[PDB]
Amino acid sequence: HNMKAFLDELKAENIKKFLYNFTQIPHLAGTEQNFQLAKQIQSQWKEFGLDSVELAHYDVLLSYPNKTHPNYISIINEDGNEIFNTSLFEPPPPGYENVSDIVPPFSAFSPQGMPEGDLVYVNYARTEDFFKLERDMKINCSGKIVIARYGKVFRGNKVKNAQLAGAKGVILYSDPADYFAPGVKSYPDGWNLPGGGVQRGNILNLNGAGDPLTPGYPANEYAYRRGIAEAVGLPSIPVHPIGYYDAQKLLEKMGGSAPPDSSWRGSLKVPYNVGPGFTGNFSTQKVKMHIHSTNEVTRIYNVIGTLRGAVEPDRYVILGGHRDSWVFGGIDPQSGAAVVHEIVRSFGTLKKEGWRPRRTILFASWDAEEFGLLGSTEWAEENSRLLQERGVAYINADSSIEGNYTLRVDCTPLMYSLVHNLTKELKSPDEGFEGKSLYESWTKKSPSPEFSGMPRISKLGSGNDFEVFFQRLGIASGRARYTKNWETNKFSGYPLYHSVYETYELVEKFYDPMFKYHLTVAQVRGGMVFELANSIVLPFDCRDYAVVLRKYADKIYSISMKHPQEMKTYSVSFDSLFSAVKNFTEIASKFSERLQDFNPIVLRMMNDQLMFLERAFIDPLGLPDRPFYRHVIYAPSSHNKYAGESFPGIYDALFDIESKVDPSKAWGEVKRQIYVAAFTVQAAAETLSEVA
Amino acid sequence: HNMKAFLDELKAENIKKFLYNFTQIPHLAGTEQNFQLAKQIQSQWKEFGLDSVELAHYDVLLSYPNKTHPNYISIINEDGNEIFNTSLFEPPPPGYENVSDIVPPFSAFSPQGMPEGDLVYVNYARTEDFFKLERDMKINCSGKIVIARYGKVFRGNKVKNAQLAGAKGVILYSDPADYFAPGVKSYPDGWNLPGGGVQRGNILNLNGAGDPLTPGYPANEYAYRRGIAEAVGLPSIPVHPIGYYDAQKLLEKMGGSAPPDSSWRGSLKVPYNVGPGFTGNFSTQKVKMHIHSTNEVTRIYNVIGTLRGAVEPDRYVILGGHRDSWVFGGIDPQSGAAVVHEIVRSFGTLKKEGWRPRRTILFASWDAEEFGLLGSTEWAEENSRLLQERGVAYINADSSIEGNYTLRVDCTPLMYSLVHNLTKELKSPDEGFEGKSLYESWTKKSPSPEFSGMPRISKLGSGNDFEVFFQRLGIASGRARYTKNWETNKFSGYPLYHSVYETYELVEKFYDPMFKYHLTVAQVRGGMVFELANSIVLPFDCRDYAVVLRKYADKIYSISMKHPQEMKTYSVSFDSLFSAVKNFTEIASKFSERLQDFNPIVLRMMNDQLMFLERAFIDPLGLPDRPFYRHVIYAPSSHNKYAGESFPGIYDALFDIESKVDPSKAWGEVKRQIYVAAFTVQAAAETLSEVA
Ligand SMILES: *[C@@H]1O[C@H](CO)[C@@H](O[C@@H]2O[C@H](CO)[C@@H](O[C@@H]3O[C@H](CO[C@H]4O[C@H](CO)[C@@H](O)[C@H](O)[C@@H]4O)[C@@H](O)[C@H](O[C@H]4O[C@H](CO)[C@@H](O)[C@H](O)[C@@H]4O)[C@@H]3O)[C@H](O)[C@H]2NC(C)=O)[C@H](O)[C@H]1NC(C)=O
Ligand SMILES: *[C@@H]1O[C@H](CO)[C@@H](O[C@@H]2O[C@H](CO)[C@@H](O[C@@H]3O[C@H](CO[C@H]4O[C@H](CO)[C@@H](O)[C@H](O)[C@@H]4O)[C@@H](O)[C@H](O[C@H]4O[C@H](CO)[C@@H](O)[C@H](O)[C@@H]4O)[C@@H]3O)[C@H](O)[C@H]2NC(C)=O)[C@H](O)[C@H]1NC(C)=O
Ligand SMILES: *[C@@H]1O[C@H](CO[C@@H]2O[C@@H](C)[C@@H](O)[C@@H](O)[C@@H]2O)[C@@H](O[C@@H]2O[C@H](CO)[C@@H](O[C@@H]3O[C@H](CO)[C@@H](O)[C@H](O)[C@@H]3O)[C@H](O)[C@H]2NC(C)=O)[C@H](O)[C@H]1NC(C)=O
Ligand SMILES: *[C@@H]1O[C@H](CO[C@@H]2O[C@@H](C)[C@@H](O)[C@@H](O)[C@@H]2O)[C@@H](O[C@@H]2O[C@H](CO)[C@@H](O[C@@H]3O[C@H](CO)[C@@H](O)[C@H](O)[C@@H]3O)[C@H](O)[C@H]2NC(C)=O)[C@H](O)[C@H]1NC(C)=O
Ligand SMILES: *[C@@H]1O[C@H](CO)[C@@H](O[C@@H]2O[C@H](CO)[C@@H](O[C@@H]3O[C@H](CO)[C@@H](O)[C@H](O)[C@@H]3O)[C@H](O)[C@H]2NC(C)=O)[C@H](O)[C@H]1NC(C)=O
Ligand SMILES: *[C@@H]1O[C@H](CO)[C@@H](O[C@@H]2O[C@H](CO)[C@@H](O[C@@H]3O[C@H](CO)[C@@H](O)[C@H](O)[C@@H]3O)[C@H](O)[C@H]2NC(C)=O)[C@H](O)[C@H]1NC(C)=O
Ligand SMILES: *[C@@H]1O[C@H](CO)[C@@H](O[C@@H]2O[C@H](CO)[C@@H](O[C@@H]3O[C@H](CO)[C@@H](O)[C@H](O)[C@@H]3O)[C@H](O)[C@H]2NC(C)=O)[C@H](O)[C@H]1NC(C)=O
Ligand SMILES: *[C@@H]1O[C@H](CO)[C@@H](O[C@@H]2O[C@H](CO)[C@@H](O[C@@H]3O[C@H](CO)[C@@H](O)[C@H](O)[C@@H]3O)[C@H](O)[C@H]2NC(C)=O)[C@H](O)[C@H]1NC(C)=O
Ligand SMILES: *[C@@H]1O[C@H](CO)[C@@H](O[C@@H]2O[C@H](CO)[C@@H](O)[C@H](O)[C@H]2NC(C)=O)[C@H](O)[C@H]1NC(C)=O
Ligand SMILES: *[C@@H]1O[C@H](CO)[C@@H](O[C@@H]2O[C@H](CO)[C@@H](O)[C@H](O)[C@H]2NC(C)=O)[C@H](O)[C@H]1NC(C)=O
Ligand SMILES: *[C@@H]1O[C@H](CO)[C@@H](O)[C@H](O)[C@H]1NC(C)=O
Ligand SMILES: *[C@@H]1O[C@H](CO)[C@@H](O)[C@H](O)[C@H]1NC(C)=O
Ligand SMILES: *[C@@H]1O[C@H](CO)[C@@H](O)[C@H](O)[C@H]1NC(C)=O
Ligand SMILES: *[C@@H]1O[C@H](CO)[C@@H](O)[C@H](O)[C@H]1NC(C)=O
Ligand SMILES: [Ca+2]
Ligand SMILES: [Ca+2]
Ligand SMILES: [Cl-]
Ligand SMILES: [Cl-]
Ligand SMILES: [Zn+2]
Ligand SMILES: [Zn+2]
Ligand SMILES: [Zn+2]
Ligand SMILES: [Zn+2]
């Protein structure tokens, strides 16, 4: 009963069967079908041999279209006649044309409204796109309906940016430039998005809050809810997503200013004029949204399975991923959920033969991830005291695939060594690498930008269920999946993301026919959990944090150094940060020596120092105006929730600082953030010093 | 080498010698004399045998009078002639008339100013005193100088209350009613305050922040400071303290309205008219303050001594008390500091014979307590991650005596059983109780109001160095000292509090000639530290928390039930709180069974559950507008920093609720606080459940 025993028990065929099982009907959060799947998973995890498996339910704000009053967009003429209407549903895929309860495309949490106005095209609606529009092109979005292409950043950031530009509505669409790979066919004949395809998704800006109505506290039976006007993160303008057939109709008539350059042009046979409004002949026509979706407090269900530790039952290693999907969830999340299911089954076989892991393993099937990480966050709010005193590590388990080229790992530096070592012991599933390790294929296909002979591992960003564990609670976290070639990655995900076309057949036919990439991902995620839950000494290397902290300090310093005059005027020094990083490096080196040179108390003392090291980067005061982003080293980018930002407090203080009215106040805040960062790094270092 | 060995080594004669040694010159925070005493203590603790003894220094905002521009108050006539001036200094006591660097009486952190106006007498300047003035008597304090008698509540609350009433200055004075015990002589012939005596003290409203310029972060070398206008807790009107000879001169001419009743009248031969202003003949005379004190960032020094644990070096039991005094500190703090010194010496003797405690003991000599708990708080801010993961308990050690009648203990419920047991094993020092236990004399003289055969133990309030450890960080905390008869206690402290007359001779002559009360307090504080640092199982009884939580829930419910109509209208239920308390009671009972029915891992797991139980009552979001008061069960009263309030969030939401303009919003907030309290109690209970 070792890791090899665990790993060998995992079967590609089982993952395939589970994926099929999980993807036959929609499992939208808050629906009966998803409660039924929750009860199924609970039953099976009990069968598989877990010690206890419970449902943890919460009543959270969700959002749904009105079934008898559909959402749509129009071009409207002078007289008020609707001369063009966008589609009410995606054409259903072959053999699903009679499946009921497919939620039509909508933007979750949009307010209701019927705004009419002139269109402005805002490219990807990124911060720099709005800078270009308002500063360089002098185009004013106030009272306009903005049309933006999906991609590059989380859609909630697009909506926030449009809102602050004064837009009265937002139309999101999938451009073939971003969601149609050259030379591959549209679904069902390949993996591309057809013109009638539409990406669902929420447009919240929760900043880690969880349920919009109950920030800080679980949405239990006696919870006291904020009123809707005080809710966290809701958009104040109507928003709706469309496909590129419909987008072409909205864009083809656009007049006003030309696109500023080619990076604003997608692939449609359209000028990509910015507007505002339409060309001469159509100048009196307007665009009208009709949004009637409702926000509703709705019950959600997490499945929580426990495999009690033999030696340290009060130490938790958590494998969690969500179960709710937009429609069938063929990739997102069921390709991940099937992998978790097989991992539970494998751990359970070992358990039935009398084995127990050293530490407690918790398994989670989260609900309502798609509506803002609501299930994971409410559960973590409920159990925060247990998690922060006992939480060793969190491994996420959403989609196992976003491509089929190579491995993707995003994790805390504390897990780098664990990942390098585990992947050296796993077989590559890649063509041309048969008989070679996963480590070998991965570093060959995804080389580190910094170190020869090492693979790329990214910072954790957000937009998934690790956010509460990592950035709020400071529990060492990681994720892994298969991905496309980093070199050709345009960072907008796979074409059928959150569409009705994301089905079992998509995966079985076009991504992973042999389920070998799924199996590899099961081995990586399960192998990580195994090592974290069983290794005598926690498998974290604090020295890996020391290396990246120096890299991040250099990076933030370099950003500041674009403003040498201001750094002189306001006496802005990074000396304290570099000093703290140097100290961390020295103390981490000494701690590592003791860790090899040392008695269960010294061990556990040692293990507690390892466990609480991620915890030490938490600031209980949070980051400015983002109280649930407490980690001082890593936060989701204020411009793109999906992206991780390092030294986020200093980064945001420096961002666009040349445009601040009061430079004294602005640079004062840069200095304050340097102080907080230097202090936190030093304090974290000191947790690794001898204890007395 | 057991507790008896430790206890027997403690000597009354040593405490006496140390008290004498610590009280010959003033030790004002931020002065050279107090840095010298810090270096002395450091040297002696090294000599006594501690493993390491370091100084931890910080640069914090302090406040001092201007030596060449003295503070004083005048009665000023029509022409602007100053016809009466208050005293510039307290007449120095016999044999100290040539001692230099006695800081004259002042209110630390007063702003500068010379306001002139009419006097209003506001009794003790409590919330209910201002309610009486403004609501019942229709007296408007706006633009008036208020005169208030010291006593009943922390002076900072008086100043806040006066400020919000619109006062333009505050004069604080010691009334003989509150600071002259009938039948005892004035210093030097007894322990009473003479008419020229004046009580120093800060008038901040920090609410746990520590250094006004650096809330959240230690005031280290690279700290970034708030500007003075954004500092925490500074008063916005000038304030000055005077003695009763001077107060009589200010009060004797007061006209306007009569005192509303006898509870407004002190003991001076004066009408206690409320004003505003003076009687007919003197109606054109005014009162003028002249305050020229300056706030200055100044270095302070804590002494931190470590005695490393043999078995759990990463578990800290902290004995801390301050060293800085207003003048000689004969009682406050040196009667406590001498006790700590002797405790260190006794632990050190044992250590030199080869003993070590099971857990690490930390000893602290804090600086700048008198200026707002600044030394303890900055150190805890620096070391917060170590303290919250490793902090077992904090025992405070300020003044060992406020009387000589019986024991006073204020502590967390987790220490009740420890205290009852320890005091049963100690000898009573009381006359008439020779050969009896301290427990016996204490419960006879200070009976519990609730339980026959038990002594009174109060809730922790604040106004001392345990505040950061208990209410911010959630470390189990306690204090103990000798006190006066509870039955005759008027709750304003001893007459010579913070006066020049608080000397070695005061204690040696009038409080504790034989130093037997000091020795008893050394045995209580040291005995507590010993048990906490050495007992195999931490000496906390979680069931004692269950009992008080029910008491507090009944109390808060009863307050709400004065508003039955509103509880009906707004559906205000305490059911969830009572449910959580019931659950806590049940789980605590089961945990206690396992604690006796159980392996060092199960033990330590068990010990961690005990250690983290106080920690579980912390809410990282803090209480409303008081982010550093995080404990949900106990906070300092919003009306009196010295007093502990239970369920403070709900208490403040209910306070004066009948006067709120918007009852819907007000009762909504009561419900929100009930939710937070019920959740926190349940979450704390669940930390005592089986871990997996
Ligand atoms: C990285 O780790 C190193 C430790 O190796 C830390 O070094 C400390 O750095 C600060 C400087 O920022 C030093 O602070 C200075 O302390 C002097 C007194 O120190 C005595 O006491 C301590 C223990 O209390 C002993 O360790 C020490 O050896 C001495 O016995 C003060 O006199 C200094 O203040 C004077 O100079 C400054 C600067 O010019 C003026 O602003 C002041 O007004 C004053 O005149 C100063 O405060 C500290 O001594 C160093 N410690 C050690 C052990 O060397 C780094 O701080 C750490 N980096 C971070 C970011 O934490
Ligand atoms: C003190 O400790 C007790 C445990 O002994 C807690 O009791 C829980 O109390 C809540 C009620 O507030 C119960 O919640 C209810 O759960 C039902 C489903 O429960 C099932 O699943 C759980 C595990 O997930 C099992 O433990 C349980 O036995 C069941 O199998 C829901 O159906 C209920 O909702 C319905 O009724 C309410 C109220 O009328 C409506 O508002 C809803 O719309 C809905 O129709 C309800 O949510 C919970 O089951 C109890 N747990 C147990 C183990 O008994 C107390 O909560 C605790 N006190 C505090 C303050 O925490
Ligand atoms: C675009 O859609 C609008 C609105 O139509 C409604 O919503 C759609 C998304 C679908 O769900 C439709 O089934 C649904 O009707 C169309 O305009 C609408 O046309 C209808 C029928 O022509 C109008 O109905 C009325 O009927 C009676 C007479 O029988 C009279 O009271 C009225 O005079 C009117 O004729 C309806 O008013 C009108 N609604 C709006 C808001 O304009 C529109 O035709 C369509 N455009 C296309 C297909 O190009
Ligand atoms: C109350 O105190 C005031 C102020 O006196 C000053 O502050 C005190 C607390 C002590 O530190 C004093 O030593 C200090 O002077 C007294 O009023 C002041 O009186 C003096 C002397 O009479 C005035 O000095 C001036 O001197 C020259 C002439 O030699 C001329 O320029 C002026 O015409 C004036 O006479 C001083 O102006 C005056 N100050 C104020 C603010 O009023 C006051 O007498 C005293 N009251 C008592 C003892 O009842
Ligand atoms: C996905 O897999 C699950 C688990 O295999 C399937 O659910 C299972 O379905 C079977 C057959 O429908 C159920 O067995 C039946 O039980 C009832 C008594 O409760 C009895 O009347 C029948 O004779 C039959 O034995 C079984 O309860 C159920 N198991 C669980 C744990 O839910 C499910 O059908 C699969 N879904 C798809 C879409 O393929
Ligand atoms: C990933 O694998 C590497 C390579 O096995 C691990 O590093 C190795 O860890 C071992 C065990 O602690 C080290 O052995 C030690 O060697 C020193 C002498 O150099 C000796 O004093 C100790 O008694 C012990 O035997 C070994 O040096 C070390 N190798 C390297 C190259 O660092 C690493 O720990 C693994 N990472 C994780 C997270 O498990
Ligand atoms: C309070 O007690 C302390 C500790 O006993 C006293 O401080 C100590 O004073 C002695 C005598 O003044 C010092 O010894 C001297 O040392 C110097 C060399 O440094 C030498 O020239 C002298 O011959 C003498 O031996 C001693 O250093 C000092 N100890 C410490 C730890 O500070 C202090 O005097 C007492 N204070 C009062 C007010 O009674
Ligand atoms: C304060 O002192 C009291 C009285 O000594 C302590 O309570 C006592 O603690 C002992 C040791 O855990 C208990 O003994 C146990 O008895 C049960 C059977 O009743 C047995 O199963 C266990 O093996 C064990 O021998 C004893 O019952 C208990 N007495 C009472 C009256 O509760 C208390 O723990 C002390 N408090 C602290 C904080 O140390
Ligand atoms: C979904 O849409 C329909 C409208 O097509 C809503 O039903 C109407 O609601 C209004 C306002 O409450 C009533 O005055 C009408 O009597 C209803 N009209 C019809 C034709 O039924 C319905 O409320 C919406 N559903 C939700 C959940 O908001
Ligand atoms: C203490 O008080 C004296 C005044 O009696 C202050 O000294 C004066 O300061 C002002 C304003 O800065 C100067 O214009 C004068 O030249 C000074 N006058 C005298 C008579 O010396 C002194 O600054 C105060 N000290 C502090 C620390 O504030
Ligand atoms: C944009 O338009 C609105 C409303 O017409 C106006 O109030 C606002 O100031 C404009 N902004 C700029 C930068 O021109
Ligand atoms: C899956 O792998 C093949 C290589 O055999 C590749 O050509 C194909 O495009 C991949 N599928 C996806 C969806 O990327
Ligand atoms: C008290 O006096 C001030 C200034 O004279 C006035 O503005 C204020 O409204 C008064 N308050 C009451 C309650 O009379
Ligand atoms: C100290 O004890 C005696 C009893 O012997 C008492 O009369 C005296 O008032 C006490 N001193 C103080 C300061 O309370
Ligand atoms: Ca919540
Ligand atoms: Ca501070
Ligand atoms: Cl993932
Ligand atoms: Cl005390
Ligand atoms: Zn998704
Ligand atoms: Zn997902
Ligand atoms: Zn004091
Ligand atoms: Zn004190």
UniProtKB/Swiss-Prot annotation, chains A, B:
Stretch list, region NAALADase: 219-532
Catalyzed chemical reaction(s): Release of an unsubstituted, C-terminal glutamyl residue, typically from Ac-Asp-Glu or folylpoly-gamma-glutamates
Gene that this polypeptide is encoded by: FOLH1
Glycosylation sites: N21, N66, N85, N98, N140, N281, N404, N421, N583
Miscellaneous: PSMA is used as a diagnostic and prognostic indicator of prostate cancer, and as a possible marker for various neurological disorders such as schizophrenia, Alzheimer disease and Huntington disease.
Effect of E369Q: Reduces enzyme activity
Cofactor binding comment, as recorded: Binds 2 Zn(2+) ions per subunit. Required for NAALADase activity.
Keywords linked to the UniProt accession: Calcium, Carboxypeptidase, Cell membrane, Cytoplasm, Dipeptidase, Glycoprotein, Hydrolase, Membrane, Metal-binding, Metalloprotease, Multifunctional enzyme, Phosphoprotein, Protease, Signal-anchor, Transmembrane, Transmembrane helix, Zinc
Annotated phenotype, changing P333A: No effect on enzyme activity
Family: Belongs to the peptidase M28 family. M28B subfamily.
pH dependence (UniProt free text): Stable at pH greater than 6.5.
Protein name: Glutamate carboxypeptidase 2
Residues that bind Zn(2+) 1: H322, D332, D398
GO CC terms, sorted: cell surface; cytoplasm; extracellular exosome; membrane; plasma membrane
